Amino acid sequence: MASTSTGLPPNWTIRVSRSHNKEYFLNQSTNESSWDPPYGTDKEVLNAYIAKFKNNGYKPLVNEDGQVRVSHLLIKNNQSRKPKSWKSPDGISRTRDESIQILKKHLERILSGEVKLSELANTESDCSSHDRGGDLGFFSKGQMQPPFEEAAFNLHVGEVSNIIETNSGVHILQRTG
């Protein structure tokens, strides 16, 4: 029964008004904000989610094991840990700024719908998870790097993060569970 699904259609996530804590929905592809559940929403699932959401300190719900699952696209650089990857076996020399500009472009194409994060990760992610559609599987708090954990647990299932920087490089995350 317990679920982390919001019931919302792809591209949509949950946001809370800055005052009076009223929840609304945001389409990350169009930037449209709607107070009414968007067309295609599973009303029952969403209501159940919102009820728990407000009782969970207004934070995204986690699964039955206290975990969340995300896929990510990582672009490494010369000042991050382990500067090498399957696609750059002899070492990565691109700078931090270079990695950021590259990822910024990827993010725009993901949000626009031109491509899915999983497809880009397959050829562009410097993480070993590239051959798993960028999937990192389920994880608990305290297992991933702080900035990555913060981003991950603050995403609702289906939501795509903005650029997150860690000691491994820069990432884009998509919560899938």
Catalytic residue among 28, 99, 118, 127: 127
Tell me which DSSP letter residue 118 carries. H
Active-site annotation holds for 28: no
Active-site annotation holds for 127: yes
**3 state SS of 154:** coil
Expressed as residue numbers, the domain containing 2 is 1-63
Q: Among 63, 93, 110, give the residue marking a domain's end.
A: 63
Question: How far, in Å, CA of 148 to CA of 19, rounded?
Answer: 27
Catalytic residue among 80, 85, 171, 174: 171
Question: How far, in Å, CA of 29 to CA of 41, rounded?
Answer: 16
Cα 76 to its chain centre, rounded Å, is 18
The amino acid at residue 93 is S
Q: What is the CATH number of the domain that holds 46?
A: 2.20.70.10
The amino acid at residue 22 is K
Contact call for residues 159 and 152 (beta carbons, < 8 A): no
CA angle 34, 40, 43 (to 5 degrees): 80
Handedness of CA 45, 10, 164, 64 (dihedral sign): positive
CA angle 82, 85, 86 (to 5 degrees): 155
Question: How far, in Å, CA of 173 to CA of 134, rounded?
Answer: 9
Question: Looking at the structure, do residues 24 and 86 belong to the same domain, yes or no?
Answer: no
Give 112's Cβ-side CA count (13 Å radius). Answer: 8
Contact call for residues 114 and 152 (beta carbons, < 8 A): no
Query: Which H, E and C letters describe 45-90, residue by residue?
Result: HHHHHHHHHHHCCCCCCCCCCCCEEEEEEEECCCCCCCCCECCECC
Question: Looking at the structure, do residues 38 and 80 belong to the same domain, yes or no?
Answer: no
Active-site annotation holds for 5: no
**Method by which the model was determined:** X-ray
Question: How far, in Å, CA of 68 to CA of 157, rounded?
Answer: 9
**3 state SS of 174:** strand
Catalytic residue among 3, 29, 67, 145: 145
- Residue 20: both structure tokens together: 């009076």
Cα 35 to its chain centre, rounded Å, is 22
Check residue 113 and give left, alpha or beta (phi > 0: left; psi -120 to 50: alpha): left
Active-site annotation holds for 143: no
Question: Looking at the structure, do residues 34 and 49 belong to the same domain, yes or no?
Answer: yes
Catalytic residue among 72, 106, 130, 156: 72
Q: What is the CATH number of the domain that holds 73?
A: 3.10.50.40
Question: Looking at the structure, do residues 166 and 86 belong to the same domain, yes or no?
Answer: yes
Catalytic residue among 71, 99, 125, 168: 168
The amino acid at residue 150 is E
The amino acid at residue 35 is W
Question: Looking at the structure, do residues 100 and 141 belong to the same domain, yes or no?
Answer: yes
Nearest to 38 by CA among 23, 49, 22, 25: 25
Active-site annotation holds for 156: no
Tell me which DSSP letter residue 132 carries. G
* Cβ neighbours of 153 (radius 10 Å): 18
Question: Looking at the structure, do residues 123 and 174 belong to the same domain, yes or no?
Answer: yes
Structurally, the chain folds into a number of domains equal to: 2
